[PDB]
Structures are given as C-alpha cells and as structure tokens.
Amino acid sequence: GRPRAFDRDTALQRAMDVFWVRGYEGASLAALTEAMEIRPPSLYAAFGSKEGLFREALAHYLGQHGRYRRDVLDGAPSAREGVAELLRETVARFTSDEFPRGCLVVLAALTGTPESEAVRDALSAERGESIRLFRERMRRGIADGDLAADTDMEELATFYATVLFGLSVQAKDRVPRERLLAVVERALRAWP
Amino acid sequence: RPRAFDRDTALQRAMDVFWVRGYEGASLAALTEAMEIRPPSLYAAFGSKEGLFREALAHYLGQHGRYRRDVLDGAPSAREGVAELLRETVARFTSDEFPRGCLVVLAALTGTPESEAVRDALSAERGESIRLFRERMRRGIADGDLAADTDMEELATFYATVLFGLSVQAKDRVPRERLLAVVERALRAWP
DNA sequence: TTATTTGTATCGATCACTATAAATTT
DNA sequence: AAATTTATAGTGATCGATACAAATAA
C-alpha cells in the first residue's frame, strides 16, 4: 500500500502529551489531530479510535515514564532507599519543566461519563500495579534482610502508593518542588 | 407561578451527578434527569452549567466540609485532631451512603481549557485543606502539644497529600480497613 | 491490478444553551 | 388580568468517527 507519511511513535508521543494535560475525555479529536499534525482519517487508520489511541499512548507512557520506577526501586541497596529514591525522582519529574505536572495514570480519568468507564478502569488497574511494584521491592527487602519478615508488605505499599497519588494532585496544584521533597522525607519517616 | 422543585434538593441531585461524573463529564441530560427539572428551569435558577457547579460545590462544602474544622478544633491535641479527621474522612470515603472519594479531588483534575475556571476553583479548595491542617497545628504550638520549631507547612502538606491520595484510593475500591491502616501509618510520621 | 494512506468534505449524535409560548400562580 | 415558571422544540457548535476520490506504493 501507500507508505505512511508520518512517524507513528512521534504521533503517539504527541497524543500522549495532549492526554497528559487534558485527560482522556478532555482531549478532543481536534486537539489530538492538531498536535499530532495528522488528519482524522489518518488517525483511525493507525490507531483505531480515541479509546485505542489512548491505550497505545498509555502503553507508550508506561514504557517511557514508568521505566524509572522499577529501575530505581530495584537499583537501591535497601527497600527503604528504593522507596525513598523513587519518591524523590517522582517529585523531580512531577516538578520538572520538561514534562506536564503529575502522573498521567492518576490525572487522566478519575471520573467521567459512563462511556469511558473502560478507560477509567484501565487506569485504576495501573494504579493497583503501583502498589504491587512497591510490595515486590519490599519482598526482596525481606529476603535481603533490610526489612522485617513479618512486616505487612501491602500496608506499606498502599501507604506509599497513597503518598504517590497525593503527590500527583499536589504537583497539578503547582506546589513547589522543595515542599514536595519535604513531604517525601516526612513520608519516609513513617517507615518501620 | 410557584416553582415545582426545591432548590436545595435539586442541588443535592446535581452534586451527586458531579460527584460521580465530574464537572465536564456530567452532561445536562444526566443533570436535568437527576434534578427532575428542565433546561430552562435550570438556567433560570443557576444561569449556567458552571454556575450550577459552583452552587453545588458550595452546598457540598456546607454538607461534607463543615465537619473537618469541627473535628480538628474539637480534639485536645493537633495530633488527635489530624488523626480523628483522617479516620472520619476514611469512614465517609468507604460508606455506601456517599460516592467514594472527595468531590474536590475527583471532579476536575484535568479537562478542556474551556473549564479552566472550575479546575482552578477546586484547586483553591484543596489549598484550604492544607490551611485547615496548618491552622490547627498553629493552635497545637500555642497549646504546647507541638514543638515551636515544627515545620508546619511540611506537616500540613504531608497530611493533605495523604488526604488527596485517600480520595484516589477510595475511588479504586480499596477496603476501609486498608485505608484505616494507611491513616495510622501516616500518623507515624508525626514529630 | 491490489492495497493502503491522505486531504477535503463531512456524517449523525450530542454538547451547552435558549426563543417562544402554554400553564399556573396572585 | 399580571407576573413567573414551566415545557416544547430547536439553536449553532462540537463531539467521535467516516465517505469519497486522489495519491502513492507493491
């Protein structure tokens, strides 16, 4: 067939930014096409629909802005330092001038119309993973000796995931990076 | 002609639609069908979808935001104030009488530029949450249950962060026991 | 062919919102 | 009657999603 006249991954990144800022439903087809510099028929050719475009953009976001999460967790000598460096780097990215403020998974679709309930549920599932990720590192901690064997791994994981989701909301509110880092250290104070 | 609907009950229904669907996600169809009124009546009473949301937000704050300051000021220490506030808030977030999560956090975090006002409004209210903590801690400094050199803005922001995160978690159907454990864990960070 | 993409033109449905007039009070 | 609030029906605009034919490949 005719060769594609646009980079698919670049269009995915630009569609991902529009979602990151306006949310799944707030990002209209007009705003998407104007940012991806393509036309609606070209979009539906490639991606399939707004829902499908968002699922590809979320998969792309998790592979580009979700890699550092597991990398800094497993790259620390202790589970506490893993959680510490993860929260610090997550605040650095939430407050960086290169990326939109906050996490896409948290801000994109918390509520909305029934039509998007699938998208919403999808994001919810990903938030669940944010807990499991924490838990897994803590598990390794228990094996490494830096964490007690009887610690409630899912309680700590849920707590630090709660702090993570709260940090997205605070970063959307333009809370200074210094105060968000102070919040991270305060949250680390709650470690057993 | 007498109006065929009570304004406060219509605001109740409208705020429920906003609580589940958010500001832009709540269409006029879903709003009018829940309030059991017609679009001309809605626009004569409130003037605009944004006006309806502002009235519903004021009503929601007078109904589900008045207890915050009362529970904070009703405790002997700032620690117990924050503790009982978080525990009560979890109890409401996990009850089946109200939609799970706080409306101020869930209604509009992102959206179209056209709704910038609404979002900013909610943001302001979120700020007040921090203030509600800060003020109490100030009293805690005077009463002597909090150190004078306590970094209040870090502590207030931390517990407000936990509060906003609890709204998100309550939306994700996290059980009440898990959220209560999260609160008791967040209290361990207290100085 | 045989197939696929691209730009122009939309499609019906739904959005927030309202002009007009009947209905219901004093 | 006079003063409001309804209900009907529909406003332009925009929503996500497409025909259609020209355009570019195997």
Coordinates of C-alpha atoms (C1' of nucleotides) in Angstrom, one line a residue:
Chain A
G1 CA 0.0 0.0 0.0
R2 CA 0.9 3.7 0.1
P3 CA 3.8 4.4 2.5
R4 CA 2.8 6.1 5.8
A5 CA 3.7 9.8 5.6
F6 CA 4.1 10.4 9.4
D7 CA 6.1 8.8 12.2
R8 CA 3.8 6.6 14.3
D9 CA 5.8 6.9 17.5
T10 CA 6.1 10.7 17.3
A11 CA 2.3 10.9 16.8
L12 CA 1.9 8.6 19.8
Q13 CA 4.1 10.9 21.9
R14 CA 2.2 14.0 20.9
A15 CA -1.1 12.3 21.5
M16 CA 0.2 11.2 24.9
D17 CA 1.1 14.8 25.9
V18 CA -2.4 16.0 24.9
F19 CA -3.9 13.3 27.2
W20 CA -1.4 14.1 29.9
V21 CA -2.7 17.6 30.1
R22 CA -6.4 17.4 29.2
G23 CA -7.2 14.0 30.2
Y24 CA -8.7 11.2 28.3
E25 CA -12.1 12.8 27.7
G26 CA -10.8 16.4 27.8
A27 CA -8.5 15.6 24.8
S28 CA -10.7 16.1 21.8
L29 CA -10.1 14.7 18.3
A30 CA -9.5 18.2 17.1
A31 CA -6.8 18.9 19.7
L32 CA -5.3 15.5 19.1
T33 CA -5.0 15.9 15.3
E34 CA -3.7 19.4 15.6
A35 CA -0.9 18.2 17.9
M36 CA -0.1 15.0 16.0
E37 CA -0.1 17.1 12.8
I38 CA -2.2 14.4 11.1
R39 CA -5.9 14.3 9.9
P40 CA -8.7 12.2 11.4
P41 CA -8.8 9.6 8.7
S42 CA -5.0 9.0 9.1
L43 CA -5.6 8.7 12.9
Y44 CA -8.3 6.0 12.6
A45 CA -6.1 4.3 10.1
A46 CA -3.3 3.7 12.5
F47 CA -4.8 3.7 16.0
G48 CA -8.4 2.7 15.6
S49 CA -10.3 5.2 17.7
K50 CA -9.8 7.6 20.5
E51 CA -10.0 4.8 23.0
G52 CA -7.5 2.7 21.1
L53 CA -5.2 5.8 20.7
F54 CA -5.3 6.3 24.4
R55 CA -4.4 2.7 25.2
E56 CA -1.4 2.9 22.8
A57 CA -0.4 6.3 24.4
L58 CA -0.8 4.9 27.9
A59 CA 1.3 1.8 27.0
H60 CA 3.9 4.2 25.5
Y61 CA 3.8 6.4 28.6
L62 CA 4.4 3.4 30.9
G63 CA 7.4 2.4 28.8
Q64 CA 8.9 5.8 28.8
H65 CA 7.8 7.5 32.1
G66 CA 7.3 4.2 34.1
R67 CA 10.7 2.6 33.4
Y68 CA 12.5 4.7 36.0
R69 CA 10.0 3.5 38.7
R70 CA 11.2 -0.1 38.6
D71 CA 14.8 0.9 37.8
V72 CA 15.2 3.0 40.9
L73 CA 13.3 0.5 43.1
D74 CA 15.4 -2.5 42.1
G75 CA 18.6 -0.4 41.8
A76 CA 18.7 0.6 45.5
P77 CA 20.6 -1.4 48.2
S78 CA 17.6 -1.5 50.6
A79 CA 13.8 -1.4 50.1
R80 CA 13.6 1.8 52.2
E81 CA 16.1 3.5 49.9
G82 CA 14.3 2.2 46.9
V83 CA 11.0 3.8 48.0
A84 CA 13.0 6.9 49.0
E85 CA 14.7 7.4 45.6
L86 CA 11.5 6.5 43.7
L87 CA 9.5 9.2 45.6
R88 CA 12.3 11.7 45.2
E89 CA 12.7 11.1 41.5
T90 CA 9.0 11.1 41.0
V91 CA 8.8 14.5 42.6
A92 CA 11.6 15.7 40.4
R93 CA 9.7 14.6 37.3
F94 CA 6.3 15.9 38.6
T95 CA 8.0 19.3 39.2
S96 CA 10.3 19.3 36.1
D97 CA 9.8 21.9 33.4
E98 CA 10.2 19.3 30.6
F99 CA 7.1 17.3 31.4
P100 CA 3.4 18.0 32.3
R101 CA 2.9 18.2 36.1
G102 CA 1.6 15.0 37.8
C103 CA 1.3 11.4 36.7
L104 CA -0.8 10.6 33.6
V105 CA -2.3 7.5 35.2
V106 CA -3.7 9.4 38.1
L107 CA -4.8 12.6 36.4
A108 CA -6.2 11.3 33.1
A109 CA -9.5 9.8 34.1
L110 CA -10.6 9.5 37.7
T111 CA -14.2 10.3 37.0
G112 CA -16.2 10.9 33.8
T113 CA -19.0 9.8 31.6
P114 CA -20.1 6.1 31.6
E115 CA -18.9 5.7 28.0
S116 CA -15.3 5.9 29.2
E117 CA -15.7 3.5 32.1
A118 CA -13.3 1.1 30.4
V119 CA -10.5 3.7 30.1
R120 CA -11.1 4.7 33.7
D121 CA -11.0 1.0 34.9
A122 CA -7.8 0.5 32.9
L123 CA -6.1 3.4 34.7
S124 CA -7.3 2.1 38.0
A125 CA -5.7 -1.2 37.3
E126 CA -2.4 0.6 36.6
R127 CA -2.7 2.4 39.9
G128 CA -3.0 -1.1 41.5
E129 CA 0.3 -2.0 39.9
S130 CA 1.9 1.0 41.6
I131 CA 1.1 -0.8 44.9
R132 CA 2.2 -4.3 43.7
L133 CA 5.5 -2.8 42.5
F134 CA 6.2 -1.3 45.9
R135 CA 5.2 -4.6 47.6
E136 CA 7.6 -6.6 45.3
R137 CA 10.6 -4.5 46.2
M138 CA 9.7 -4.8 49.9
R139 CA 9.5 -8.6 49.4
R140 CA 13.1 -8.5 48.1
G141 CA 13.9 -6.4 51.1
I142 CA 12.6 -9.1 53.4
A143 CA 14.8 -11.6 51.6
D144 CA 17.8 -9.2 51.7
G145 CA 17.5 -8.7 55.5
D146 CA 16.8 -4.9 55.4
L147 CA 13.1 -5.5 56.1
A148 CA 11.4 -7.5 58.9
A149 CA 10.0 -10.8 57.9
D150 CA 6.5 -10.1 59.4
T151 CA 6.0 -6.6 58.0
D152 CA 2.7 -6.1 56.3
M153 CA 4.0 -5.5 52.8
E154 CA 0.7 -4.4 51.3
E155 CA 0.0 -1.9 54.1
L156 CA 3.3 -0.1 53.4
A157 CA 2.8 -0.5 49.7
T158 CA -0.7 1.0 49.9
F159 CA 0.6 3.8 52.1
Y160 CA 3.4 4.8 49.8
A161 CA 1.1 4.5 46.7
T162 CA -1.3 6.8 48.6
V163 CA 1.5 9.3 49.0
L164 CA 2.3 8.9 45.3
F165 CA -1.3 9.6 44.2
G166 CA -1.4 12.6 46.5
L167 CA 1.8 13.9 45.0
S168 CA 0.2 13.9 41.6
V169 CA -2.6 16.0 42.9
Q170 CA -0.2 18.4 44.6
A171 CA 2.0 18.7 41.6
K172 CA -1.0 19.5 39.5
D173 CA -1.7 22.3 42.1
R174 CA 1.9 23.7 41.4
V175 CA 3.2 23.0 44.9
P176 CA 6.9 23.9 44.9
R177 CA 9.4 21.0 44.4
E178 CA 11.1 21.8 47.7
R179 CA 8.0 21.4 49.7
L180 CA 7.1 18.2 47.8
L181 CA 10.5 16.8 48.6
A182 CA 9.9 17.7 52.2
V183 CA 6.7 15.7 52.0
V184 CA 8.6 12.7 50.7
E185 CA 11.1 12.8 53.6
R186 CA 8.2 13.2 56.0
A187 CA 6.5 10.1 54.5
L188 CA 9.7 8.2 54.8
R189 CA 9.7 9.0 58.5
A190 CA 6.7 6.6 58.7
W191 CA 8.8 3.6 57.7
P192 CA 9.1 0.8 60.3
Chain B
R1 CA -46.3 30.7 39.4
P2 CA -44.7 28.7 42.2
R3 CA -41.6 26.7 41.3
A4 CA -42.1 23.0 41.2
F5 CA -38.8 22.0 42.7
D6 CA -36.9 22.7 45.9
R7 CA -33.5 24.4 45.2
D8 CA -31.6 22.5 47.9
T9 CA -32.8 19.1 46.8
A10 CA -32.1 19.9 43.2
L11 CA -28.6 21.0 44.3
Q12 CA -28.3 17.7 46.1
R13 CA -29.1 15.6 43.0
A14 CA -26.8 17.9 40.8
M15 CA -23.9 17.5 43.2
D16 CA -24.3 13.7 43.2
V17 CA -24.0 13.7 39.4
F18 CA -20.9 15.9 39.7
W19 CA -19.6 13.6 42.4
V20 CA -19.7 10.5 40.1
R21 CA -19.0 12.1 36.7
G22 CA -17.0 15.2 37.5
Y23 CA -17.7 18.7 36.1
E24 CA -17.4 18.2 32.4
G25 CA -18.3 14.5 32.5
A26 CA -21.8 15.4 33.9
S27 CA -23.9 16.3 30.9
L28 CA -27.0 18.5 31.1
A29 CA -29.1 15.4 30.2
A30 CA -27.8 13.5 33.3
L31 CA -28.1 16.6 35.4
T32 CA -31.6 17.5 34.4
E33 CA -32.8 13.9 34.7
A34 CA -31.5 13.6 38.2
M35 CA -32.8 17.0 39.3
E36 CA -36.1 16.1 37.6
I37 CA -36.2 19.6 36.0
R38 CA -36.0 21.0 32.5
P39 CA -33.1 23.0 31.0
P40 CA -35.0 26.4 31.0
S41 CA -35.6 26.0 34.8
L42 CA -32.0 25.0 35.5
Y43 CA -30.7 28.1 33.6
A44 CA -33.2 30.4 35.2
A45 CA -32.1 29.3 38.7
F46 CA -28.4 28.9 38.1
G47 CA -27.6 30.6 34.9
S48 CA -25.0 28.2 33.6
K49 CA -23.6 24.8 34.0
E50 CA -20.6 26.4 35.7
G51 CA -23.0 28.3 37.9
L52 CA -24.7 25.1 38.8
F53 CA -21.4 23.5 39.7
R54 CA -20.4 26.5 41.9
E55 CA -23.7 26.3 43.8
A56 CA -23.3 22.5 44.1
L57 CA -19.7 22.9 45.3
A58 CA -20.8 25.5 48.0
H59 CA -23.6 23.1 49.0
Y60 CA -21.2 20.1 49.1
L61 CA -18.8 22.1 51.3
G62 CA -21.5 23.2 53.7
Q63 CA -22.6 19.5 53.9
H64 CA -19.3 17.5 53.7
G65 CA -16.7 20.2 54.6
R66 CA -18.1 21.7 57.8
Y67 CA -17.1 18.6 59.9
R68 CA -13.4 19.0 59.0
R69 CA -12.8 22.2 61.0
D70 CA -15.2 21.0 63.8
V71 CA -13.3 17.7 64.3
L72 CA -10.0 19.5 64.1
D73 CA -10.9 22.1 66.7
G74 CA -12.8 19.5 68.8
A75 CA -9.7 17.5 69.7
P76 CA -7.3 18.2 72.7
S77 CA -4.2 17.9 70.6
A78 CA -3.3 18.7 67.0
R79 CA -2.2 15.0 66.6
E80 CA -5.5 13.7 67.7
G81 CA -7.2 16.3 65.6
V82 CA -5.5 15.2 62.4
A83 CA -6.0 11.6 63.4
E84 CA -9.7 11.8 64.0
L85 CA -10.1 13.9 60.9
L86 CA -8.4 11.3 58.7
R87 CA -10.3 8.5 60.4
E88 CA -13.7 10.2 59.9
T89 CA -12.8 11.1 56.3
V90 CA -12.0 7.4 55.6
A91 CA -15.3 6.4 57.2
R92 CA -17.1 8.6 54.8
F93 CA -15.0 7.6 51.8
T94 CA -15.8 4.0 52.3
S95 CA -19.5 4.3 53.2
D96 CA -22.2 3.4 50.7
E97 CA -24.4 6.4 51.5
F98 CA -22.0 8.8 49.7
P99 CA -19.9 8.4 46.5
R100 CA -16.4 7.2 47.4
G101 CA -13.7 9.8 47.4
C102 CA -13.8 13.6 47.9
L103 CA -15.6 15.7 45.2
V104 CA -13.0 18.4 45.4
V105 CA -10.3 16.0 44.3
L106 CA -12.3 13.8 41.8
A107 CA -14.5 16.4 40.0
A108 CA -11.9 18.1 37.7
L109 CA -8.2 17.5 37.8
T110 CA -7.7 17.7 34.0
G111 CA -10.0 18.7 31.2
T112 CA -10.5 21.1 28.3
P113 CA -9.2 24.7 28.5
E114 CA -12.8 26.0 28.5
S115 CA -13.2 24.6 32.0
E116 CA -10.0 26.2 33.5
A117 CA -12.1 28.2 35.9
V118 CA -13.8 25.2 37.5
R119 CA -10.4 23.4 37.9
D120 CA -8.7 26.4 39.5
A121 CA -11.7 26.8 41.9
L122 CA -11.3 23.2 43.1
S123 CA -7.5 23.7 43.4
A124 CA -8.2 26.7 45.7
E125 CA -10.4 24.5 47.8
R126 CA -7.6 21.9 48.0
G127 CA -5.3 24.7 49.3
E128 CA -7.9 25.3 52.1
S129 CA -7.4 21.7 53.2
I130 CA -3.7 22.4 53.8
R131 CA -4.7 25.6 55.6
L132 CA -7.2 23.6 57.8
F133 CA -4.3 21.5 58.9
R134 CA -1.8 24.4 59.3
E135 CA -4.2 26.5 61.4
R136 CA -4.8 23.6 63.8
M137 CA -1.1 22.9 64.1
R138 CA -0.7 26.6 65.0
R139 CA -3.0 26.1 67.9
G140 CA -1.1 23.0 68.7
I141 CA 2.0 25.2 69.1
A142 CA 0.2 27.5 71.5
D143 CA -1.4 24.7 73.5
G144 CA 2.1 23.1 73.9
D145 CA 1.4 19.8 72.2
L146 CA 3.5 20.7 69.2
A147 CA 7.1 21.9 69.2
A148 CA 7.7 25.5 68.4
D149 CA 10.3 24.7 65.7
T150 CA 7.9 22.3 64.0
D151 CA 7.9 22.6 60.2
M152 CA 4.2 23.2 60.0
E153 CA 3.9 23.6 56.2
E154 CA 5.7 20.3 55.6
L155 CA 3.4 18.5 58.0
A156 CA 0.2 20.1 56.8
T157 CA 1.2 19.4 53.1
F158 CA 2.1 15.9 54.0
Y159 CA -1.3 15.1 55.6
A160 CA -3.1 16.9 52.8
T161 CA -1.1 14.7 50.4
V162 CA -2.3 11.6 52.3
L163 CA -5.9 13.1 52.2
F164 CA -5.9 13.6 48.4
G165 CA -4.3 10.1 47.9
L166 CA -7.0 8.6 50.1
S167 CA -9.7 10.1 47.8
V168 CA -8.0 8.4 44.8
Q169 CA -7.7 5.1 46.7
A170 CA -11.4 5.2 47.8
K171 CA -12.3 5.6 44.1
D172 CA -10.2 2.5 43.4
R173 CA -12.5 0.5 45.8
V174 CA -9.7 0.0 48.4
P175 CA -11.3 -1.6 51.5
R176 CA -11.9 0.5 54.6
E177 CA -9.5 -1.5 56.8
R178 CA -6.7 -0.9 54.3
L179 CA -7.3 2.9 54.3
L180 CA -7.5 3.0 58.1
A181 CA -4.1 1.2 58.2
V182 CA -2.9 3.9 55.8
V183 CA -4.1 6.6 58.2
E184 CA -2.5 5.0 61.2
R185 CA 0.7 4.6 59.2
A186 CA 0.6 8.3 58.2
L187 CA 0.4 9.2 61.9
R188 CA 3.7 7.5 62.5
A189 CA 5.3 10.4 60.5
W190 CA 4.2 12.8 63.2
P191 CA 7.1 14.6 65.1
Chain C
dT1 C1' -4.5 -4.5 -10.5
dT2 C1' -4.5 -4.8 -5.2
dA3 C1' -3.8 -2.3 -1.3
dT4 C1' -3.2 1.4 1.8
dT5 C1' -2.8 6.4 3.1
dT6 C1' -4.2 11.3 2.8
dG7 C1' -6.8 15.6 2.4
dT8 C1' -11.5 17.5 1.9
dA9 C1' -15.7 17.1 2.8
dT10 C1' -18.4 16.0 6.1
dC11 C1' -21.9 12.2 9.0
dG12 C1' -25.5 11.8 12.9
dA13 C1' -25.4 12.4 17.7
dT14 C1' -24.7 15.1 21.5
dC15 C1' -23.0 19.4 23.7
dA16 C1' -24.4 23.7 26.4
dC17 C1' -28.0 26.7 25.9
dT18 C1' -32.4 29.3 24.6
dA19 C1' -36.6 31.6 21.8
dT20 C1' -41.3 31.1 22.3
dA21 C1' -45.4 30.2 24.3
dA22 C1' -48.7 27.5 27.4
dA23 C1' -49.5 26.7 32.3
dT24 C1' -50.0 28.3 37.0
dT25 C1' -50.0 31.2 40.5
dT26 C1' -51.5 36.2 42.8
Chain D
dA1 C1' -56.0 40.3 34.3
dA2 C1' -50.3 40.5 35.5
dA3 C1' -46.2 38.1 36.9
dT4 C1' -43.3 33.9 36.7
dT5 C1' -42.2 29.3 35.8
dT6 C1' -42.6 25.8 33.4
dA7 C1' -42.4 22.6 28.8
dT8 C1' -41.7 22.1 23.8
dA9 C1' -38.8 22.3 20.3
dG10 C1' -34.7 23.5 18.5
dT11 C1' -30.3 26.9 18.2
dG12 C1' -25.2 26.8 16.4
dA13 C1' -21.3 24.4 17.7
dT14 C1' -18.6 20.5 18.5
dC15 C1' -18.2 15.6 19.7
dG16 C1' -16.0 10.9 17.8
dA17 C1' -15.9 8.8 13.7
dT18 C1' -16.2 8.4 8.0
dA19 C1' -17.2 8.5 2.6
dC20 C1' -15.0 9.7 -1.1
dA21 C1' -11.6 10.1 -4.5
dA22 C1' -7.0 11.5 -5.4
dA23 C1' -2.4 9.9 -4.3
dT24 C1' 1.4 6.6 -3.6
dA25 C1' 3.3 2.2 -3.0
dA26 C1' 3.8 -3.4 -4.2

